[PDB]
Symmetry: D2
Subunit: 120 residues, 4 copies
Amino acid sequence: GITGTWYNQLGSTFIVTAGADGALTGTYESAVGNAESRYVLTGRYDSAPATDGSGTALGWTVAWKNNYRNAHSATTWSGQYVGGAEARINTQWLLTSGTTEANAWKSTLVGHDTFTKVKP
Amino acid sequence: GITGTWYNQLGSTFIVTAGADGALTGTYESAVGNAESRYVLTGRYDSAPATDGSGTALGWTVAWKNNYRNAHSATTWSGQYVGGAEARINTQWLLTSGTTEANAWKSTLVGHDTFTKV
Amino acid sequence: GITGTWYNQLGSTFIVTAGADGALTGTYESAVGNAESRYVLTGRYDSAPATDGSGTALGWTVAWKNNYRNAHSATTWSGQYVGGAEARINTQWLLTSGTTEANAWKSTLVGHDTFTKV
Amino acid sequence: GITGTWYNQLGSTFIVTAGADGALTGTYESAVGNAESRYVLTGRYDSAPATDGSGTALGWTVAWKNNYRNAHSATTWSGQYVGGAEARINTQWLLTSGTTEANAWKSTLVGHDTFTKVKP
Ligand SMILES: O=C(CCCC[C@@H]1SC[C@@H]2NC(=O)N[C@@H]21)NCCNC(=O)c1c(-c2ccccc2)cccc1-c1ccccc1
Ligand SMILES: O=C(CCCC[C@@H]1SC[C@@H]2NC(=O)N[C@@H]21)NCCNC(=O)c1c(-c2ccccc2)cccc1-c1ccccc1
Ligand SMILES: O=C(CCCC[C@@H]1SC[C@@H]2NC(=O)N[C@@H]21)NCCNC(=O)c1c(-c2ccccc2)cccc1-c1ccccc1
Ligand SMILES: O=C(CCCC[C@@H]1SC[C@@H]2NC(=O)N[C@@H]21)NCCNC(=O)c1c(-c2ccccc2)cccc1-c1ccccc1
């Protein structure tokens, strides 16, 4: 299932609990960027996915403020969980920083992360 | 600041409460798509933003399942709150549906919404 | 239709000619970023679009090198032309810079531009 | 170099010539979607990349009309070429379909493609 400890291709660690009714709650530790230690994450997932072999839609957010650092930014990941012998969460993400209105055009990075349960 | 009722350019409704710990909680009603009634949202925001004229970074997620409908999809909005009179939240979003592996290339829509506080 | 001079909400300038074969060619001048003067653009559009009220799909690219400056980056705009009086091109864009492998995660910005025909 | 025949992770074929002054010109055959045979592509790349080990920025567009089909849509790929023993083009893409104004919110798919010169 979705609940567990996941790692992306950068070595970031995503520890999450999937609640029965659709909540995602956990912590995220980024291997890159202006970040140290764990950050709070929350999100949602489809708690009754289709029964046709499709993945399970989900998303979550981290605001990059914790007890140690504040990067004045937030990332959201949107994607799907694909179960099986080697489960995956395939995502695309948007990282928005707080900017002035004049710099808003350069506020948001986009990328993609693949998560597996394999510890690097 | 963030706490309140917001609408976007499609006529969708966002009711949110921003907690002291950086939490966002509330409900979302979409004017479009495979959606009816309110859906749970959850997210996070920068609870100690810069005071140099920058927006406040925030994001949230809605999974499009409630007790009335399930679209097997989820949207995340990533953006920033711009306060003052005429408060706005400017976002870009990703909407992913659950797909088979063969259809995964067409799983995700992208767009942008502007929210106005009422 | 598409052929002409366009501006966006940032004050950038897009001069384009749409060819019978689906080609777009022209020049772009950005109001923002690491850019000065005109840059070559090239792209494609649907030269036989639907006539049922749909926009006309199109995209183009600018690499941010000209004979005056090089920002080691490139933007692509993907969107659709909506004709008539008050013609518009509504787009979303991806701006990728050349990076080292360690910095690749932060290579690409995303945004949206609306162009108005003059 | 960039000039050559590339394949993505779906098995699509990207045949391109990189002109000396920044042009990309070629053809694209998609393994998926409403597509058959080759489609014209054009784009641009940085014809004088940095000399610090960075990739080469580039982008290109395909409108999905050819002699056989018209899907009333266009894809742009934005990314970078990374040379070496196993050269790659790493991209993110936007696929916009012509829609009514009311359906514009659902006009654009986003994804990512990785290209290599290895024929599947
Ligand atoms: O670095 C972070 C937090 C960690 C992000 C980690 C990302 S989440 C998507 C991806 N997946 C993963 O596991 N890790 C990465 N936030 C960006 C904060 N922005 C700046 O510091 C900044 C930047 C910038 C932007 C992106 C990446 C690196 C640097 C550039 C210019 C200005 C700023 C800036 C300055 C003042 C206030 C706010 C932002
Ligand atoms: O419609 C929704 C839920 C509501 C989204 C509203 C969006 S959120 C971003 C934006 N902002 C806002 O306020 N409203 C919109 N989700 C997409 C569900 N997808 C499908 O049913 C689907 C579609 C499709 C695409 C767009 C709109 C409607 C339907 C196309 C092909 C296949 C599917 C599909 C089939 C089976 C299972 C899952 C998806
Ligand atoms: O500024 C440009 C060229 C002009 C883009 C204009 C954009 S196109 C989408 C939008 N629409 C429009 O009309 N104008 C804007 N390219 C980015 C170059 N990147 C860097 O120099 C860079 C940056 C950065 C990010 C945003 C703006 C300015 C600079 C941040 C970190 C590192 C780099 C960097 C360093 C070395 C080599 C390449 C990139
Ligand atoms: O399928 C294509 C062309 C081929 C795209 C291949 C993509 S390019 C990004 C990726 N990389 C790659 O190598 N292959 C894929 N265009 C989409 C045309 N849209 C529709 O037919 C359509 C769809 C839809 C959207 C995306 C994918 C599949 C289907 C859904 C609803 C309505 C339409 C539609 C109807 C009438 C007119 C236009 C669009």
